[PDB]
Design a protein around this ligand. Structure first.
Ligand code: NAD
Ligand code: NAD
Ligand code: AG2
Ligand code: AG2
Lengths: 474, 474
């Protein structure tokens, strides 16, 4: 039977009951021991309420806001008798503020994104830099510097960001082993960064192809996706953003850096979901991905940075998302950007509405001696239905990563604010792997210069195929 | 009863029996009197052979090539009694060479495209300019100069190019009445151009939205379209191309012109089917179109050119395609350009495989006192099935235009080499309109600057919304 990993000796407050909350609830019920009445879900949606009622769980129909979050969450999280867990799977709420509240009150915390309070992105006074995930992540890093240690709070532990950080570590270990380099895995950040450097990893794509197909044709003026439409659209309209590698010799005119922080990132003055990059996955082969911002684009690049004695970064990989979402989402983006406005309506594909497909999600490490190596999950919708209810393949990759992060936090409850790169990757993947379907590593000789130059002149760097100059669709 | 317009007393030689041939042959049988045994269909494919045999129509299973076209076609064209008609609906054949052969032998000719002999576009020696439809059109214009008058040959008489030239004329007439511009209806090229000038038409999009949806989900590694995949892909990989208006104040760095010829065109050093433009149709509202080259982009701009005494152009409209193909074609393009190569397979949607949708195809005239005006056809697949067999809505707009061109050529058989702009638009529309479904004019206040500037800085021209600088997606 399914492993029960830990007892939760206090309230479980789930904030948000959308596609991820719905997929995560049954895993929490499955894998943790707790009096069922300890769990309560908070979401303003009527649709969410009706589903919660059907699932028999306590439900509070309320939006968490800057104005009410303390009066609402403090009593719920401290109801006792022991340590509670705030599982934040919402939109429109401040990850940082909720995380800091949980910590102040001794509750564990996890989320899958650094989200700001509602209103954040449509303020007519926020410059593009302030919209970036770099900036948002810096608020979390600052919180950690201000209050080191204390109760564990796991930031950005979904599929991506989240799981993909563990994939990068496993991929680095495999690359070394495949070269016949034996010896202990790295144990410190510095050792991981040096392993990437020593293997000659120039960069990393979070290389995803979602092939889930709907049972109905795409409706006009409806945005369709396999996870949050609101969240995807919001992220898609943020600047394109990437961790910026030391090997890069060119950036677009509209690229910008940051005055402060870890130094690992740049962003482009254009929306990520309307920015294409040339990339590759095992099922897609060569494909376009969208250069949508993601926390791990920065966090992984930062994590794998090697500095000289003077503190200057001398090695860092490029890192960014190369996302090919489901066909209906591709059409939805073309519709949205073509119209200049959000569709009037949206829907998230339910497992009952998906005829077939997988969410192929992995990390593509490139520039090393074997050119490119993709490592990740090929979870199908059919396998998903066999192993976890109320979600599609996209959702299960996320919900199972939340499960893994929750197990890690319960096992390591005094670790302070941590990112996915800080967790024990082997333990997290041991928890998650039952929900990931095939997890495979595949080498390819494909590069962004395959078939180039073609019929027209192009500004390419033929000496270094994986330069962003060659990857970016221009 | 359907009108039988004329008797055709000689051979009817149909070159190519793909999607358009299959839709055109029944209209030919319906609307012309002739002995059925005088029709001959030539196509290399077994698929076509079986379809022609099912119709009891004479079939020759050959590819027409530069090597064989004279020995193959001359006996067919001249079999008598009296004047034959060459109906060229093929790919991979030289429109100019076959046209010249037909003329030399006194046969009428019609096609829907200026196509080169197979091998043309894979010539790695070929400079981009030589790939352009402007160049191909110039070979036809030079043929007309070399041999003025003589037997009628109608070049590029499909839906677009073809029918849309007639829509431009009607739209100009409608604009003149709605704007209160007095004067007799034009009856010469010079008068038409002067009317466009007087109305202040800055430019024209061939503004198309195909909403035909398939009964099956898009297959991986299959290019799906509603008409020729080979043709669309070929055109899609040609340079983006447009008739270039005198009002334009900016062109991109990768734009180029021509050293000779009519002067009406530019092209961009990038593939047209991977070039997006901001455009509009009544059903789509604001949308992206692809800037795919088309003969009429040049022919309409040229036709509507006003010159001073020196022969310098003082007015000319911008004119180009802004094509939003069916959803499966949009996905197919993303797949093809993302992979850097043609899919392994392709299919053209049969009417039996289309669940719903329309081919909304018109002309969007902009820059005048009522901003923008769209005029064209909203033909649905349902209406298509009721009125014509063996084709979808895309096919019927094309096949009915070929019918109109054939009627016109029979009534005007010594007009020499002509384009759709040279034909009597009222007579052609009188023949075609029964097959076009709703034909409507719609004004809109939309402009390419709607919603702009937005979240990010953009290199726009705020002085004049319709500038190509604002239309082109960068
Ligand atoms: N790291 C990853 O891999 C990953 C993957 C998917 C989603 N996410 C993120 O997880 C979150 C949930 O995604 P989803 O697919 O479930 O989204 P969703 O849009 O399906 O659901 C979001 C839910 O939040 C609720 N909500 C809105 N305002 C709220 C408020 N003020 N307080 C409480 N709840 C509120 C909505 O009613 C909705 O049910 C999103 O922020 C998304 O960006 C991360
Ligand atoms: N102006 C317009 O509106 C318009 C619209 C659609 C198509 N077209 C053009 O019309 C033509 C026909 O389109 P379609 O949808 O029927 O294309 P299709 O791809 O369905 O059919 C093309 C046919 O040509 C045949 N063919 C190939 N090589 C040949 C050769 N050497 N000699 C004779 N036949 C040969 C093929 O076997 C096939 O049956 C294409 O060139 C296309 O570009 C124009
Ligand atoms: N990483 C993002 N920008 N969004 C969340 C993506 C989740 C789909 N695997
Ligand atoms: N005009 C072209 N480039 N191709 C022909 C398109 C026919 C779709 N109405």
């Amino acid at each position: 039977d399914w492993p029960v990993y830990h007892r939760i000796d206090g309230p479980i407050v789930m904030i948000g009951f959308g596609s991820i909350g719905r997929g995560t609830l049954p895993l929490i019920e499955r894998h943790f021991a707790f009096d069922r009445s300890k769990l309560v879900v908070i979401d303003p949606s009527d649709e969410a309420r009706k589903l919660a009622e059907a699932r028999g769980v306590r439900f509070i129909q309320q939006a968490v806001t800057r104005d009410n979050y303390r009066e609402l969450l403090v009593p719920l999280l401290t109801a006792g008798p022991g340590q509670g867990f705030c599982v934040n799977l919402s939109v429109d709420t401040s990850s940082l503020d909720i995380m800091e509240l949980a910590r102040e009150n001794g509750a564990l915390y996890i989320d899958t994104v650094v989200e700001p309070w509602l209103g954040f992105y449509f303020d007519p006074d926020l410059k593009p830099e302030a919209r970036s995930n770099y900036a948002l992540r810096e608020t979390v890093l600052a919180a950690r510097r201000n209050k080191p240690g204390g109760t564990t709070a796991v930031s950005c532990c979904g599929a991506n960001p989240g799981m993909v950080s563990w994939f990068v570590k496993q991929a680095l270990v495999n690359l070394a082993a495949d070269l016949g380099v034996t010896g202990e895995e790295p144990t410190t950040r510095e050792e991981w960064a040096r392993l990437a450097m020593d293997l000659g990893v120039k960069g990393i794509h979070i290389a995803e192809r979602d092939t889930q197909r709907a049972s109905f044709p795409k409706p006009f003026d409806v945005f369709v996706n396999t996870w949050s439409v609101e969240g995807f659209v919001s992220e898609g309209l943020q600047p394109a953003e990437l961790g910026w590698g030391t090997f890069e010799r060119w950036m677009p005119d509209n690229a910008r850096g940051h005055d402060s922080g870890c130094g690992a990132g740049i962003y482009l003055l254009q929306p990520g979901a309307n920015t294409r990059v040339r990339s590759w996955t095992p099922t897609a082969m060569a494909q376009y991905g969208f250069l949508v911002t993601s926390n791990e684009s920065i966090s992984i690049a930062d994590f794998l940075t090697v500095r000289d004695a003077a503190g200057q970064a001398v090695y860092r990989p490029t890192c960014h998302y190369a996302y090919h979402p489901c066909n209906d989402a591709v059409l939805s983006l073309h519709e949205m950007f073509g119209s200049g406005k959000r569709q009037s309506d949206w829907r998230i594909l339910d497992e009952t509405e998906i005829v077939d497909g997988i969410d192929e999600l992995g990390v593509l490490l490139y520039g090393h001696g074997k050119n490119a190596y993709w490592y990740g999950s090929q979870l199908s919708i059919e396998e998903t239905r066999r192993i976890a209810p109320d979600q599609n393949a996209t959702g299960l990759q996320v919900s199972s990563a939340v499960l893994a992060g929750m197990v890690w936090a319960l096992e390591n409850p005094n670790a302070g604010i941590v990112e996915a790169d800080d967790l024990d990757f082997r333990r997290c993947l041991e928890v998650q792997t039952p929900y990931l379907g095939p997890v495979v590593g595949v080498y390819t000789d494909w590069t962004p210069l395959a078939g180039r130059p073609g019929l027209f002149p192009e500004d390419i760097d033929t000496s270094d195929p994986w330069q962003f100059r060659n990857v970016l669709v221009r």
